[PDB]
UniProtKB/Swiss-Prot annotation, chains A, B, C, D, E, F, G, H, I, J, K:
Keywords from the UniProt entry: Capsid protein, Helical capsid protein, Virion
Protein name, entry field: Capsid protein
Primary localisation category: virion
Subcellular location: Virion
Gene Ontology cellular-component annotations: helical viral capsid
Molecular-function GO terms, alphabetical: identical protein binding; structural molecule activity
Note: The genome of this virus consists of three linear, positive, single-stranded RNAs encapsidated in separate virions designated RNA-alpha, RNA-beta and RNA-gamma. Three proteins (alpha-A, beta-A and gamma-A) are translated directly from these genomic RNAs and the remaining proteins encoded on RNA-beta (beta-B, beta-C and beta-D) and RNA-gamma (gamma-B) are expressed via three subgenomic messenger RNAs.
Family affiliation: Belongs to the virgaviridae capsid protein family.
Keyword Aminoacyl-tRNA synthetase: no
Length: 177, 177, 177, 177, 177, 177, 177, 177, 177, 177, 177
């Protein structure tokens, strides 16, 4: 979970954090790492309808993606620590604000994926000794998938650095006394 | 159950607690931990219709989620104890007020899940020696599930800290004499 | 049965207890403990239609829930005994007044549950050597269940402490002479 | 991932990088190497509908293509280091700015490719001992493929060198003091 | 039987013991030792359906578990005797109040276990000289077991020390005159 | 059983231990050692369905895992005793708080494992002189195992040191007078 | 277990170790040696489905791989001790942070491997005196293996030296006074 | 393992090695010797599907191929030491950078090779005294092999000398003071 | 029989001995010496099913094990007499309280051992002049033995010294007047 | 029995020995000498199933292994007595704490070994004048042996010196006054 | 046993030996001499399945191989004593650290070797006056042998001199004062 920045130094004033960032309007609002989100993106490009265990994979990743908000005062929104120029830099984390509309779209995928099933035939028709099977209820889903996903990739979402997160919501870091 | 804060110190005046918080309007009203609720969220993302024991899992979690209200005078609404800055902080608990409408929605899921069944065929057609089975009564449910759940995730619910719970309902903590 | 408070000290005047609390209007009117009722609630969330012994469980709990009224003069409506502040408190019992309408709803569940049956087939078709079975008379019940229960959870019922039970019905405790 | 140029020397001023290149308008916007993209191109020319494992190949390459943006201050947009004339040159990298419209086209291919299937027949009709099979749902796809791809090759996309990337978006490299 | 504390010193007043603890509401209500109950727990985790003598073990333990209530005036509810700090302490006994509902659940296990049988075949088909046998009536039981037991472990039951048993039911110990 | 720290020195105040740690909310709640739990983990990775005596091994370990809570006043939550720097340190014990939900999951494994059986055939068909056998009722279990276990490993559980156990539940150690 | 670096010298401040590295976010998170992990990699390349004892080998290695985290204050994250240039160097250990998603993938392999079986036929059909056998339940697994493994090799995981482990999580080593 | 060049002389600056070559982007990225790789190539040209022990040969070589990266500061990327002209030269090592895509292709071969099997028939039908056998599941594999291999040979991969490895990633060798 | 400590000195008060130790709750409850019990343990490890006279050995030892309770007022629970330090010490006896459940387990062994028999054949088939014999009714017993015994060894039983036996049951020794 | 260190000097305080080492948690817990245990190890490597008298050897050694705990106050945990440097040293004893789980594993071997038998045939078929014999009930055991033993060798158990035994359980040696 | 180096001179500091080399992580970890191990290697190359006494030879050597760790302070890890150049040198001992995985592999061989048997036929069918015999249970073993051994030879294990053993684990030799 992306809370990789030291607790200490401190701190958000606690008049505004209460007011603006917690209580209403950030948290319980999702956050994924850039060049960590992309990876999420392709696990799903990227998937074969249909063999089982290749479908349960959609469900699996969304947990542990990993998804959190990094600054929890006493924390700074991750930066990250280097001087410009000298080669110990670690230049920034950039984070994605997914929106009230989309997490409920990512969700759509998670159970656009599996459908109630009659699989157990194998323990029947084939093994003690036909069926073939029906495919269609998959096919439409496999296509429904292609759209809900082609939206996901082609949907320019807001990026946020430490520089921005203090600007968009004004919070002061209050450096020691 | 989230009653993690010391009994002692005390106490809510007992003129208002009786009046406002107990008797009518909080209790018997649910409360789940943030970043503890989310986890609830994904156990359910997050589920395969249909194999048994993957359906009874919805029922199972809602008990022990865990769900309670933390301040019971003599108790303070959990805070939690640290000074800002110095790295022994434990910064806050933030709690979800689910609403008279939703607990009866979470409930919907719990028994949107299982349906009366003819499973015992296995002890018949297959084992002493076909059936296949019928799927449809599952399928619709599996889709009914996808909606009642896509509401759950995309439903911005009220968050409450110690700072807020004394403000929204005014109670005084009455520090020793 | 929630009669956990000492007999002794005494007592309700016996002019009003006769008049108001016994004779007509409380007793034979049900009472369940809070955070003891909830538990009742989830045993039933919380149940699989259909395997037997998972249905007889509804019937079983309603007896021993446990259900009684706590003050029987010479008794005080349970309080309970602690000073505020000092950590030997036991802060209150809060009790649910279920209503003439609902106990006859909880009842509905108890025998919404089982139905006359042809089970004994197992001792026939399957064991000396098919049937499958019919499910439908269960299915509707399983859904009838989901409603009579989704009312139960989402039905804000009156809570009562010692503070309230003497106020709503005025009784004096008559402390020794 | 094409970040082949030394971290060090530094650096983009950090007034404009924040403003123009990160935050909004480059990143999360794709970048493929020239004469590295072409190779991508022909893996797909270049493919046989239908044998399996010859279809999963579309999915596979798009990850690891490889795709990234090279300058992350403190980094210079790769150049690359040689003097003109003397035979240690490494003359330039030239990079493709694919567009909001196309990555969602490349995506189209990735799952224009596989479709829900009834393959498991082989473990049936043929192996324990006909079917033939149906082809048509492939055929149309195989043709749908030919168009979405004939666009890809015949779509002149913007090339960018170090010389250009500082011109199109004005950033200064700030050489030591 | 957990009556390990000296008879003597005395005594419960005998106005309340009669009233509250004996007569109605404790006794004939079960009591098992903590870290003595757990052991009970795992003898049953913890069992193989099916070989005989591995099933009669459920029956066997519940007697001698051991189960009793410790204070019988003239007795103190076991404490136990040490000063804090100095290393002859014996710090407390903590006891489980199992409930009217559960002892009738523990019972369920005891004869969920054995079933009427045709074992004597061995003295027939096999020894003077086939049968195999039927398993199914075991199998369901073995699964019925898994649930009635998974309730037992995951059922947080009330713990009681000397400190509590005098508080929950108010009794005075009456130290010599 | 992890009670490895000296009785003596003392002691938890006994106002809070009664209140918070015993009575309700820790005990009867499980505790396994880190890098002692892992070992538990792999005994189960780690197991062959099916040969007998390779299945009874699941049952066997869970007892003696070993599982207890270490501080029982008069005891300190194990630390452990060294100065920083000088090489007689023994740096800490870190302990796992498994949850009301999981011990009833670990339990699931214990009897997900064995099933009622017809083994005794060997003393028949084969030895006095076929059968083969049926495998399927194992196979599903072996797969059911793979999931209930893949949850166990991939379930980040709370770690607790002496530093934390006094913070999360506030108890004072009361050093001699 | 890779704890090869001297205890002594000391030490991590113990304000941050508690905060950041232990408690939550490293430990119970896996760590394998580079050019020690690779070896793990090929034991599994690298395996024949199916002869027994060539399948139990997957299970066997994952224990003792060997897997631990090296710095436990008072310990330094292994370095390792040499001056640059002079030929007694031992240049670094580089370690793999496997992720919450993957250890539950490595696990998948461990019991993707064995399946419930009817082997004992050999002691029957063949030895006292046919069967052949069925292969298919292996075959699919053998292919399922090929994918879960082709992910393992082609999954660029994070490498960490002493230089990095203090940077990514900021800890100070506190050299003697 | 190709680390044939003296440790000593030294050394890579350790500002860039950390930055560029280790940490992310070379290591855990494979390296095979030229005119040592070719040999690998033909062991596989070069193989008979199917006799056993002629298939396990694919698996065997990939370990010990041998595969490593040669410069580990304090090491120089192998050169190798001679003056031009005078006949003690040893002119260069040239190394292959296989890519994230291909090692997962070489892997494909390793277990494209063996399949779950019914071989043990020989100990049956033939030896105690038909079967013939089935070939097809081999045949397709033998052809699948021919393609995944005809890619391997006809895939021009990047060659790297000492001259290049310092140019492509800029590292300085820092000759004594 | 372990009554090795002088009669004399005296004595247990005879108000408590009657009350607590005799009458009900110690005696007729077994007691074996430590490092005298172990020896019992291995005589049984430790035994060959089956030759006669190697089976009657189980029966034989349990009598004379030897088993008794040592203090019979006027007796002190054996101590034993030495000063600390000076080398005439005899430091303690430590005794095992076997439980109502186990003596009936040790018993199980005693006649798990022999079974009704047809031995006398030897005086027939073999001596005046075949039979072989049947083994199976032994074999199962020999295995039944292995379990009832593997419980015995791995069952941590309570140890008791003089220091403890006066603490667990409070008795005073009453030294002369 | 490893009690090789002089009685005298003295002594463990007798407040802690009672508390911690005896009573509960060491004794009746096994202890074998290092480089004395190994020898045990190979007597069993190391054994031929099957000729009799080569099987009774497992049983025989476990008694007299030899197994005891060395310090019995008044005793010091054996050290052993030498000064460093001067060649009369006897440097340490190091001892193995086998665990509640393993002694019940070593036990397994002891009677994994012998099985009820029909040997006496020799006095029949062969000597007064065929049989051959049956082997299988041995064979499986011989293999069952190979596993329960391959655990024994590859199970890193805790080593303890005098230095450690006073640290892990804190006891003071109390040197004369 | 390779403890060939004088006791005397001394000594390992005894702060680190306790910490690092003994207690946990070397001892009970095996050690074989180079060009003494090889010899072990070929006794096993090197063996004929099957004649008896040519199989018991595997078992025999592993004891007395010989296997120990040479430095036991007060001892130096054997060196060995000569000056470079002058022809009384004895240049080094180099030792093999076999691993937790392999000693349990060498073990495999030891009882991969013998199997329960029916040999005694010779005293029957052949000598008083056919059988032939069955070979197969040997044959597979003889092949199982060939693999577990072809791993042993082709498994590059770590070599250690005095120079290395003080470097890998840092211990100081402390030369007289």
């Amino acid at each position: 979970n992306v809370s990789l920045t030291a607790k200490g130094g401190g701190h958000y004033i606690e008049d505004q954090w209460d007011t603006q960032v917690v209580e209403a309007g950030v948290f319980d609002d999702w956050w994924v790492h850039v060049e960590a989100w992309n990876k999420f993106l392709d696990n799903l490009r990227g998937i074969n309808f249909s063999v089982a265990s290749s479908r349960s994979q959609v469900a699996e990743y969304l947990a542990a993606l990993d998804r959190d908000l990094p600054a929890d005062v006493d924390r700074r929104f991750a930066g990250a620590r280097g001087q410009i120029g000298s080669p110990n830099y670690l230049p920034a984390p950039k984070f994605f604000r997914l929106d009230k509309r989309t997490i409920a779209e990512l969700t759509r995928l998670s159970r656009l994926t599996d459908q109630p099933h009659n699989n157990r035939d194998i323990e029947l028709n084939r093994a003690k000794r036909l069926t073939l099977r029906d495919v269609q209820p998959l096919k439409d889903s496999a296509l429904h998938y292609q759209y809900v996903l082609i939206d996901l990739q082609s949907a320019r979402l807001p990026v946020y650095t430490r520089k921005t997160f203090e600007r968009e919501l004004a919070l002061e870091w209050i450096i020691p006394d």
